[PDB]
Amino acid sequence: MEPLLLAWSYFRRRKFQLCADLCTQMLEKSPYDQAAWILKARALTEMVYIDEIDVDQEGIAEMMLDENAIAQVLAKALFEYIFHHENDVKTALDLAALSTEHSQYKDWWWKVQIGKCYYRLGMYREAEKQFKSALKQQEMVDTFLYLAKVYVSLDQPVTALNLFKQGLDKFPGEVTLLCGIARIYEEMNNMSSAAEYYKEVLKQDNTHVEAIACIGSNHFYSDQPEIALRFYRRLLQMGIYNGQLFNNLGLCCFYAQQYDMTLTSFERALSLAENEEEAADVWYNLGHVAVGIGDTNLAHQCFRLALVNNNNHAEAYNNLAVLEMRKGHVEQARALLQTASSLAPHMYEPHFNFATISDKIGDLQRSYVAAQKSEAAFPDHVDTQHLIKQLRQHFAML
Amino acid sequence: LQEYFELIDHHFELRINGEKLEELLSERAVQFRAIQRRLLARFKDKTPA
Amino acid sequence: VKSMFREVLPKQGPLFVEDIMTMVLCKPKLLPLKSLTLEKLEKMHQAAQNTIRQQ
């Protein structure tokens, strides 16, 4: 029959919305057809289907979004599957447990799926005993991304290492394993041993997008702003065309001293920006350009427009009120750093900068608790340790 | 101003009793969130729970 | 006699003689590139507002 074939042939070329209506057009022709019932099911599944976490691949982060280069460096089986886009985990778990007792082996898929249901809720240990048994029978790449996903959320960075060197020698040269191992090294900031693995996901597989930025960002910091451009002009030629990339392409050409593409790339980045909170960050990076040419009147209204397009931009409140202290507005500056700190209770830069305004005045009590948090949020700073010992001589005696 | 000073006190003591009935509910809500997390760590459809 | 072109540069610079305690700025940030799941999940959720804007 031509309707049943055209329904199945629409699923093969994944014309999904043209498939579900034509399949349910066959639904009233029968009391129950098992083939159309699962096809109406499975074409409705793949409309939206995401598996992993929001894995948004940064280039400039260490802890709670901090910057860098001033710190350092049967047929019911798919009927089960309709519950997994609806995320009703417990209801699916009954017929999952019903069917695995119906056939109590030869189903590693049902073994790893029930463990995925347990991780979807929060049953950590019950998942951790579940799909380990499936790995002892079957060699599958996603199961290594299942054992070594729950263990990192269980916070054991050495138990992630053994799986990422076990399956790497049964699936040699595999790509997404070699990206999973260099992603936990950036969590502990082990970039001595992270960026060698990201030189392997670029050795073979020379177009993986999320390991092109995370090398082309770790060269823009630590003073290779020309090599970091080469990783970003190549990422343009794949043809992704975001607004975030014309920001990063604008910054690398300026610091590499290439003054042609340095600023047209920002005007294309001001346009085609999605949210109103997003065009703030392109105005903010434009401010660091404007400090570089020396124009402060220009620079004063670049952070301001970043601030009126988005309040609670904590990196701009600090950055605007260094330009104020250059002019003389002390009480104006000391309130912006006062509210830059309360928006970012990390990120040492307002805390230390409070304790060189409030030290020149003479208030050595608030200028201690200021330069207290500029030690706890970033130790091994130089000019904090030349300031606490400057204050602790005043506190003992004359 | 003397009779005014009586009303500012028992309002403030009612604020003090307002500051006394609040901390007992919070830790028992911390007890209430701990018992939910004890449930969801345990609530599953098999034997040992 | 072709050209002089002698513009003698000083060959010396203003060396520092002490450090000064100064105020430093926040450093410029490179924006992250969102993944193809985050690009899909935002696009789906952005259309989820317009279908509830009419209903």
Side-chain angles (χ1 to χ4, degrees), chain B residues 8-43:
Chain B
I8 67 180
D9 269 324
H10 88 281
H11 165 264
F12 175 68
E13 306 316 300
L14 200 45
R15 181 201 171 97
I16 284 298
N17 304 115
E19 278 173 320
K20 212 62 72 192
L21 306 182
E22 46 91 18
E23 72 274 13
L24 170 57
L25 272 179
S26 49
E27 181 42 58
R28 287 195 192 277
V30 165
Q31 289 162 10
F32 204 62
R33 68 105 185 168
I35 187 172
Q36 301 327 300
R37 287 189 73 188
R38 189 62 257 150
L39 290 160
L40 60 90
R42 276 207 292 243
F43 182 71

mmCIF file of all heavy atoms in Angstrom, chain B residues 8-43:
data_model
loop_
_atom_site.group_PDB
_atom_site.id
_atom_site.type_symbol
_atom_site.label_atom_id
_atom_site.label_comp_id
_atom_site.label_asym_id
_atom_site.label_seq_id
_atom_site.Cartn_x
_atom_site.Cartn_y
_atom_site.Cartn_z
ATOM 1 N N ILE B 8 5.855 52.788 70.947
ATOM 2 C CA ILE B 8 6.980 52.397 70.106
ATOM 3 C C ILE B 8 7.654 51.150 70.655
ATOM 4 O O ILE B 8 8.362 50.449 69.925
ATOM 5 C CB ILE B 8 7.978 53.559 69.953
ATOM 6 C CG1 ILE B 8 8.664 53.875 71.280
ATOM 7 C CG2 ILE B 8 7.273 54.797 69.462
ATOM 8 C CD1 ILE B 8 9.666 55.004 71.192
ATOM 9 N N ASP B 9 7.441 50.841 71.936
ATOM 10 C CA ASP B 9 8.104 49.694 72.542
ATOM 11 C C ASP B 9 7.355 48.401 72.252
ATOM 12 O O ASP B 9 7.934 47.455 71.712
ATOM 13 C CB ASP B 9 8.252 49.905 74.049
ATOM 14 C CG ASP B 9 9.559 50.580 74.415
ATOM 15 O OD1 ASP B 9 10.578 50.300 73.749
ATOM 16 O OD2 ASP B 9 9.571 51.389 75.364
ATOM 17 N N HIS B 10 6.061 48.351 72.585
ATOM 18 C CA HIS B 10 5.286 47.128 72.397
ATOM 19 C C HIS B 10 5.043 46.813 70.927
ATOM 20 O O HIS B 10 4.750 45.661 70.593
ATOM 21 C CB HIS B 10 3.953 47.228 73.140
ATOM 22 C CG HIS B 10 2.857 47.859 72.342
ATOM 23 N ND1 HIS B 10 2.749 49.222 72.173
ATOM 24 C CD2 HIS B 10 1.811 47.313 71.676
ATOM 25 C CE1 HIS B 10 1.689 49.489 71.432
ATOM 26 N NE2 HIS B 10 1.103 48.348 71.117
ATOM 27 N N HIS B 11 5.150 47.808 70.045
ATOM 28 C CA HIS B 11 5.264 47.508 68.624
ATOM 29 C C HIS B 11 6.594 46.834 68.328
ATOM 30 O O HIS B 11 6.649 45.846 67.586
ATOM 31 C CB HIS B 11 5.110 48.784 67.795
ATOM 32 C CG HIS B 11 5.552 48.635 66.371
ATOM 33 N ND1 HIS B 11 6.811 48.993 65.940
ATOM 34 C CD2 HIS B 11 4.901 48.165 65.280
ATOM 35 C CE1 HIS B 11 6.917 48.750 64.647
ATOM 36 N NE2 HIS B 11 5.773 48.247 64.222
ATOM 37 N N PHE B 12 7.681 47.358 68.905
ATOM 38 C CA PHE B 12 9.000 46.782 68.670
ATOM 39 C C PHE B 12 9.139 45.414 69.316
ATOM 40 O O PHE B 12 9.814 44.540 68.764
ATOM 41 C CB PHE B 12 10.091 47.718 69.186
ATOM 42 C CG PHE B 12 11.472 47.145 69.085
ATOM 43 C CD1 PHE B 12 12.054 46.929 67.846
ATOM 44 C CD2 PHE B 12 12.182 46.808 70.223
ATOM 45 C CE1 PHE B 12 13.324 46.397 67.744
ATOM 46 C CE2 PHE B 12 13.451 46.271 70.129
ATOM 47 C CZ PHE B 12 14.024 46.070 68.887
ATOM 48 N N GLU B 13 8.514 45.205 70.478
ATOM 49 C CA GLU B 13 8.477 43.860 71.042
ATOM 50 C C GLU B 13 7.634 42.925 70.189
ATOM 51 O O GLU B 13 7.966 41.742 70.065
ATOM 52 C CB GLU B 13 7.953 43.878 72.478
ATOM 53 C CG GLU B 13 8.683 44.820 73.418
ATOM 54 C CD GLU B 13 10.188 44.759 73.259
ATOM 55 O OE1 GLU B 13 10.770 43.675 73.466
ATOM 56 O OE2 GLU B 13 10.789 45.803 72.930
ATOM 57 N N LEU B 14 6.562 43.434 69.575
ATOM 58 C CA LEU B 14 5.820 42.622 68.618
ATOM 59 C C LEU B 14 6.641 42.366 67.362
ATOM 60 O O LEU B 14 6.466 41.333 66.706
ATOM 61 C CB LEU B 14 4.495 43.295 68.268
ATOM 62 C CG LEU B 14 3.413 42.386 67.682
ATOM 63 C CD1 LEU B 14 3.300 41.091 68.473
ATOM 64 C CD2 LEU B 14 2.077 43.106 67.649
ATOM 65 N N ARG B 15 7.541 43.289 67.020
ATOM 66 C CA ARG B 15 8.530 43.015 65.985
ATOM 67 C C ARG B 15 9.570 42.017 66.483
ATOM 68 O O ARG B 15 10.087 41.207 65.703
ATOM 69 C CB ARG B 15 9.184 44.326 65.546
ATOM 70 C CG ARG B 15 10.230 44.212 64.451
ATOM 71 C CD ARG B 15 11.136 45.429 64.467
ATOM 72 N NE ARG B 15 12.280 45.283 63.573
ATOM 73 C CZ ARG B 15 12.328 45.780 62.343
ATOM 74 N NH1 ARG B 15 11.300 46.463 61.864
ATOM 75 N NH2 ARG B 15 13.406 45.603 61.593
ATOM 76 N N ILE B 16 9.890 42.061 67.781
ATOM 77 C CA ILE B 16 10.793 41.072 68.366
ATOM 78 C C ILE B 16 10.135 39.697 68.390
ATOM 79 O O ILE B 16 10.756 38.692 68.021
ATOM 80 C CB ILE B 16 11.252 41.531 69.765
ATOM 81 C CG1 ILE B 16 12.301 42.638 69.641
ATOM 82 C CG2 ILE B 16 11.810 40.378 70.587
ATOM 83 C CD1 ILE B 16 13.560 42.208 68.924
ATOM 84 N N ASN B 17 8.860 39.627 68.791
ATOM 85 C CA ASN B 17 8.117 38.385 68.597
ATOM 86 C C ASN B 17 7.868 38.090 67.125
ATOM 87 O O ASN B 17 7.699 36.922 66.763
ATOM 88 C CB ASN B 17 6.780 38.400 69.345
ATOM 89 C CG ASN B 17 6.935 38.679 70.827
ATOM 90 O OD1 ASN B 17 6.483 39.704 71.333
ATOM 91 N ND2 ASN B 17 7.579 37.759 71.533
ATOM 92 N N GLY B 18 7.843 39.115 66.272
ATOM 93 C CA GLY B 18 7.901 38.871 64.843
ATOM 94 C C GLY B 18 9.240 38.310 64.410
ATOM 95 O O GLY B 18 9.305 37.493 63.487
ATOM 96 N N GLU B 19 10.320 38.728 65.071
ATOM 97 C CA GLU B 19 11.641 38.156 64.841
ATOM 98 C C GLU B 19 11.889 36.889 65.648
ATOM 99 O O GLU B 19 13.019 36.391 65.650
ATOM 100 C CB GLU B 19 12.733 39.180 65.165
ATOM 101 C CG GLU B 19 13.007 40.175 64.058
ATOM 102 C CD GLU B 19 13.972 41.263 64.483
ATOM 103 O OE1 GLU B 19 13.863 41.737 65.632
ATOM 104 O OE2 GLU B 19 14.841 41.642 63.670
ATOM 105 N N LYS B 20 10.877 36.370 66.343
ATOM 106 C CA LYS B 20 11.000 35.135 67.104
ATOM 107 C C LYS B 20 10.229 33.972 66.505
ATOM 108 O O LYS B 20 10.635 32.824 66.682
ATOM 109 C CB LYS B 20 10.531 35.347 68.548
ATOM 110 C CG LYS B 20 11.264 34.491 69.569
ATOM 111 C CD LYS B 20 12.751 34.808 69.610
ATOM 112 C CE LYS B 20 13.018 36.157 70.256
ATOM 113 N NZ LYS B 20 14.420 36.608 70.039
ATOM 114 N N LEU B 21 9.127 34.239 65.807
ATOM 115 C CA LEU B 21 8.360 33.177 65.169
ATOM 116 C C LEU B 21 8.873 32.828 63.780
ATOM 117 O O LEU B 21 8.288 31.961 63.123
ATOM 118 C CB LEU B 21 6.886 33.572 65.082
ATOM 119 C CG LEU B 21 6.182 33.992 66.372
ATOM 120 C CD1 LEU B 21 4.718 34.294 66.096
ATOM 121 C CD2 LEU B 21 6.320 32.922 67.436
ATOM 122 N N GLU B 22 9.940 33.476 63.316
ATOM 123 C CA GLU B 22 10.432 33.263 61.961
ATOM 124 C C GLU B 22 11.545 32.224 61.884
ATOM 125 O O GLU B 22 11.600 31.451 60.922
ATOM 126 C CB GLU B 22 10.903 34.594 61.364
ATOM 127 C CG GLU B 22 11.772 35.440 62.287
ATOM 128 C CD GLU B 22 13.253 35.161 62.137
ATOM 129 O OE1 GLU B 22 13.648 34.580 61.105
ATOM 130 O OE2 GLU B 22 14.026 35.524 63.048
ATOM 131 N N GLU B 23 12.433 32.178 62.876
ATOM 132 C CA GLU B 23 13.570 31.270 62.805
ATOM 133 C C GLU B 23 13.195 29.840 63.158
ATOM 134 O O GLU B 23 13.917 28.913 62.777
ATOM 135 C CB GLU B 23 14.696 31.763 63.720
ATOM 136 C CG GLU B 23 14.433 31.598 65.211
ATOM 137 C CD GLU B 23 13.654 32.753 65.814
ATOM 138 O OE1 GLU B 23 13.105 33.577 65.054
ATOM 139 O OE2 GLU B 23 13.579 32.829 67.058
ATOM 140 N N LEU B 24 12.080 29.639 63.863
ATOM 141 C CA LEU B 24 11.643 28.290 64.191
ATOM 142 C C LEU B 24 11.039 27.590 62.981
ATOM 143 O O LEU B 24 11.212 26.376 62.828
ATOM 144 C CB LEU B 24 10.642 28.346 65.351
ATOM 145 C CG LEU B 24 9.843 27.109 65.764
ATOM 146 C CD1 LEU B 24 10.777 25.960 66.110
ATOM 147 C CD2 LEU B 24 8.940 27.424 66.944
ATOM 148 N N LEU B 25 10.368 28.336 62.101
ATOM 149 C CA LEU B 25 9.811 27.741 60.893
ATOM 150 C C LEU B 25 10.880 27.445 59.852
ATOM 151 O O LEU B 25 10.714 26.517 59.056
ATOM 152 C CB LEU B 25 8.752 28.660 60.285
ATOM 153 C CG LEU B 25 7.316 28.498 60.783
ATOM 154 C CD1 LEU B 25 6.386 29.501 60.114
ATOM 155 C CD2 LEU B 25 6.830 27.079 60.560
ATOM 156 N N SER B 26 11.975 28.211 59.844
ATOM 157 C CA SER B 26 12.984 28.074 58.798
ATOM 158 C C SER B 26 13.788 26.790 58.962
ATOM 159 O O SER B 26 14.007 26.062 57.989
ATOM 160 C CB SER B 26 13.917 29.284 58.801
ATOM 161 O OG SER B 26 14.381 29.561 60.108
ATOM 162 N N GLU B 27 14.239 26.502 60.187
ATOM 163 C CA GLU B 27 14.989 25.276 60.429
ATOM 164 C C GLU B 27 14.084 24.055 60.330
ATOM 165 O O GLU B 27 14.529 22.982 59.905
ATOM 166 C CB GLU B 27 15.668 25.348 61.801
ATOM 167 C CG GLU B 27 16.522 24.141 62.202
ATOM 168 C CD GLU B 27 17.371 23.602 61.061
ATOM 169 O OE1 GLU B 27 18.188 24.372 60.513
ATOM 170 O OE2 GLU B 27 17.228 22.410 60.716
ATOM 171 N N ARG B 28 12.804 24.205 60.667
ATOM 172 C CA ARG B 28 11.881 23.099 60.453
ATOM 173 C C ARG B 28 11.513 22.964 58.982
ATOM 174 O O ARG B 28 11.123 21.876 58.543
ATOM 175 C CB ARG B 28 10.642 23.279 61.326
ATOM 176 C CG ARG B 28 10.934 23.013 62.794
ATOM 177 C CD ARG B 28 9.677 22.824 63.614
ATOM 178 N NE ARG B 28 9.957 22.843 65.047
ATOM 179 C CZ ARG B 28 10.376 21.793 65.745
ATOM 180 N NH1 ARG B 28 10.565 20.622 65.150
ATOM 181 N NH2 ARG B 28 10.604 21.911 67.046
ATOM 182 N N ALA B 29 11.632 24.046 58.208
ATOM 183 C CA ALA B 29 11.589 23.912 56.756
ATOM 184 C C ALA B 29 12.882 23.315 56.222
ATOM 185 O O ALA B 29 12.863 22.602 55.211
ATOM 186 C CB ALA B 29 11.317 25.263 56.095
ATOM 187 N N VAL B 30 14.011 23.608 56.876
ATOM 188 C CA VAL B 30 15.252 22.897 56.586
ATOM 189 C C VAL B 30 15.107 21.429 56.968
ATOM 190 O O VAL B 30 15.579 20.534 56.254
ATOM 191 C CB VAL B 30 16.435 23.587 57.300
ATOM 192 C CG1 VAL B 30 17.678 22.701 57.349
ATOM 193 C CG2 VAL B 30 16.770 24.897 56.607
ATOM 194 N N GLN B 31 14.397 21.154 58.065
ATOM 195 C CA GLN B 31 13.992 19.785 58.360
ATOM 196 C C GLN B 31 12.985 19.273 57.338
ATOM 197 O O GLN B 31 12.954 18.075 57.039
ATOM 198 C CB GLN B 31 13.408 19.698 59.768
ATOM 199 C CG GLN B 31 14.425 19.855 60.879
ATOM 200 C CD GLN B 31 13.778 20.191 62.206
ATOM 201 O OE1 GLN B 31 12.558 20.122 62.348
ATOM 202 N NE2 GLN B 31 14.595 20.556 63.186
ATOM 203 N N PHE B 32 12.154 20.163 56.789
ATOM 204 C CA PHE B 32 11.172 19.723 55.802
ATOM 205 C C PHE B 32 11.819 19.481 54.445
ATOM 206 O O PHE B 32 11.348 18.639 53.679
ATOM 207 C CB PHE B 32 10.034 20.735 55.670
ATOM 208 C CG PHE B 32 8.753 20.138 55.158
ATOM 209 C CD1 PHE B 32 8.105 19.143 55.872
ATOM 210 C CD2 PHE B 32 8.202 20.565 53.959
ATOM 211 C CE1 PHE B 32 6.928 18.586 55.405
ATOM 212 C CE2 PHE B 32 7.025 20.012 53.484
ATOM 213 C CZ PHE B 32 6.387 19.022 54.210
ATOM 214 N N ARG B 33 12.885 20.211 54.113
ATOM 215 C CA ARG B 33 13.553 19.923 52.848
ATOM 216 C C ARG B 33 14.496 18.734 52.979
ATOM 217 O O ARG B 33 14.793 18.068 51.982
ATOM 218 C CB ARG B 33 14.299 21.157 52.326
ATOM 219 C CG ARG B 33 15.506 21.598 53.143
ATOM 220 C CD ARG B 33 16.827 21.245 52.466
ATOM 221 N NE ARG B 33 17.975 21.567 53.309
ATOM 222 C CZ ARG B 33 19.218 21.166 53.062
ATOM 223 N NH1 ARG B 33 19.477 20.421 51.997
ATOM 224 N NH2 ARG B 33 20.202 21.507 53.884
ATOM 225 N N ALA B 34 14.976 18.456 54.194
ATOM 226 C CA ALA B 34 15.857 17.313 54.397
ATOM 227 C C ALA B 34 15.079 16.008 54.318
ATOM 228 O O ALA B 34 15.612 14.978 53.887
ATOM 229 C CB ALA B 34 16.572 17.427 55.745
ATOM 230 N N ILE B 35 13.809 16.033 54.725
ATOM 231 C CA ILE B 35 13.025 14.807 54.710
ATOM 232 C C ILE B 35 12.510 14.528 53.298
ATOM 233 O O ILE B 35 12.322 13.370 52.918
ATOM 234 C CB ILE B 35 11.902 14.875 55.771
ATOM 235 C CG1 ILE B 35 11.163 13.544 55.913
ATOM 236 C CG2 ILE B 35 10.900 15.966 55.470
ATOM 237 C CD1 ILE B 35 10.195 13.533 57.070
ATOM 238 N N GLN B 36 12.342 15.573 52.475
ATOM 239 C CA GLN B 36 12.044 15.351 51.058
ATOM 240 C C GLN B 36 13.247 14.759 50.337
ATOM 241 O O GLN B 36 13.103 13.870 49.489
ATOM 242 C CB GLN B 36 11.629 16.653 50.362
ATOM 243 C CG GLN B 36 10.410 17.393 50.896
ATOM 244 C CD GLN B 36 9.330 16.501 51.463
ATOM 245 O OE1 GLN B 36 8.774 15.650 50.769
ATOM 246 N NE2 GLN B 36 9.013 16.704 52.735
ATOM 247 N N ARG B 37 14.448 15.245 50.665
ATOM 248 C CA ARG B 37 15.654 14.723 50.031
ATOM 249 C C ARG B 37 15.978 13.328 50.541
ATOM 250 O O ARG B 37 16.634 12.541 49.849
ATOM 251 C CB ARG B 37 16.827 15.673 50.265
ATOM 252 C CG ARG B 37 16.743 16.958 49.456
ATOM 253 C CD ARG B 37 18.023 17.768 49.559
ATOM 254 N NE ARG B 37 19.114 17.173 48.792
ATOM 255 C CZ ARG B 37 20.373 17.596 48.837
ATOM 256 N NH1 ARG B 37 20.701 18.619 49.614
ATOM 257 N NH2 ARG B 37 21.303 16.998 48.105
ATOM 258 N N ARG B 38 15.523 13.000 51.751
ATOM 259 C CA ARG B 38 15.633 11.627 52.230
ATOM 260 C C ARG B 38 14.644 10.724 51.503
ATOM 261 O O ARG B 38 14.916 9.538 51.284
ATOM 262 C CB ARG B 38 15.417 11.580 53.744
ATOM 263 C CG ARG B 38 15.733 10.233 54.387
ATOM 264 C CD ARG B 38 17.201 9.867 54.213
ATOM 265 N NE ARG B 38 17.400 8.872 53.162
ATOM 266 C CZ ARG B 38 18.499 8.778 52.419
ATOM 267 N NH1 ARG B 38 19.503 9.623 52.604
ATOM 268 N NH2 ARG B 38 18.591 7.840 51.486
ATOM 269 N N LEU B 39 13.487 11.275 51.115
ATOM 270 C CA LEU B 39 12.529 10.497 50.335
ATOM 271 C C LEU B 39 13.045 10.228 48.930
ATOM 272 O O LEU B 39 13.079 9.075 48.492
ATOM 273 C CB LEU B 39 11.179 11.205 50.249
ATOM 274 C CG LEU B 39 10.306 11.312 51.495
ATOM 275 C CD1 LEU B 39 9.308 12.423 51.306
ATOM 276 C CD2 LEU B 39 9.615 10.027 51.804
ATOM 277 N N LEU B 40 13.458 11.278 48.213
ATOM 278 C CA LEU B 40 13.805 11.127 46.802
ATOM 279 C C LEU B 40 15.106 10.352 46.623
ATOM 280 O O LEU B 40 15.362 9.797 45.549
ATOM 281 C CB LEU B 40 13.871 12.500 46.124
ATOM 282 C CG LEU B 40 14.832 13.611 46.567
ATOM 283 C CD1 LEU B 40 16.183 13.561 45.859
ATOM 284 C CD2 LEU B 40 14.182 14.973 46.371
ATOM 285 N N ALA B 41 15.945 10.305 47.661
ATOM 286 C CA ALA B 41 17.077 9.387 47.639
ATOM 287 C C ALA B 41 16.618 7.949 47.849
ATOM 288 O O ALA B 41 17.282 7.006 47.402
ATOM 289 C CB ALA B 41 18.103 9.787 48.698
ATOM 290 N N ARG B 42 15.483 7.760 48.523
ATOM 291 C CA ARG B 42 14.981 6.431 48.849
ATOM 292 C C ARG B 42 13.845 5.967 47.944
ATOM 293 O O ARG B 42 13.800 4.778 47.616
ATOM 294 C CB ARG B 42 14.509 6.388 50.307
ATOM 295 C CG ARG B 42 15.618 6.127 51.312
ATOM 296 C CD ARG B 42 15.080 5.458 52.568
ATOM 297 N NE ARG B 42 14.209 6.344 53.337
ATOM 298 C CZ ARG B 42 14.465 6.754 54.575
ATOM 299 N NH1 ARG B 42 15.571 6.358 55.192
ATOM 300 N NH2 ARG B 42 13.616 7.558 55.200
ATOM 301 N N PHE B 43 12.950 6.866 47.519
ATOM 302 C CA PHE B 43 11.700 6.486 46.857
ATOM 303 C C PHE B 43 11.986 5.897 45.481
ATOM 304 O O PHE B 43 12.247 6.627 44.518
ATOM 305 C CB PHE B 43 10.761 7.684 46.742
ATOM 306 C CG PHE B 43 9.435 7.360 46.118
ATOM 307 C CD1 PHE B 43 8.498 6.603 46.807
ATOM 308 C CD2 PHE B 43 9.119 7.819 44.848
ATOM 309 C CE1 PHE B 43 7.272 6.303 46.238
ATOM 310 C CE2 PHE B 43 7.894 7.524 44.271
ATOM 311 C CZ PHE B 43 6.971 6.765 44.968
#
